[PDB]
Amino acid sequence: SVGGLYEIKIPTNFTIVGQEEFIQTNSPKVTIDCSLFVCSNYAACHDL
Amino acid sequence: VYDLSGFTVKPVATVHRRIPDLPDCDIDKWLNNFNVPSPLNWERKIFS
Numbered sequence: 876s877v878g879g880l881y882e883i884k885i886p887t888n889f890t891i892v893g894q895e896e897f898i899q900t901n902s903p904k905v906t907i908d909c910s911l912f913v914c915s916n917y918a919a920c921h922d923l
Numbered sequence: 924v925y926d927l928s929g930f931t932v933k934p935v936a937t938v939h940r941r942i943p944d945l946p947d948c949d950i951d952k953w954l955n956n957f958n959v960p961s962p963l964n965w966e967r968k969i970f971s
């Protein structure tokens with residue numbers, strides 16, 4: 876501080892900048908038919 | 924709301940395809956041969 880004053884850079888001209896942000900709030904609702912995935916339609920597999 | 928396991932559509936017919944691997948005997952081709960021998964000089968062919 877020279878004489879009680881500090882050197883500061885103060886803006887003399889400005890613009891607006893746009894900044895886009897994506898926030899994920901959802902995901903695909905995956906549904907699995909567990910019996911059809913594991914065994915398809917085979918009776919011996921469904922029994923096991 | 925309940926996701927009910929609807930049946931898979933049952934196949935109505937069967938399709939089989941496979942290379943026969945071994946060649947055809949073609950017994951008819953040799954039997955249809957017009958130059959048939961006499962019993963005196965009977966011809967012999969082995970189909971293996």
Ligand SMILES: *[C@@H]1O[C@H](CO)[C@@H](O)[C@H](O)[C@H]1NC(C)=O
Nearest residue numbers: 885886887888889890891892
């Ligand atoms: C501010 O900047 C813009 C673009 O750089 C210019 O058109 C405008 O004249 C400037 N204004 C001042 C006061 O410096």
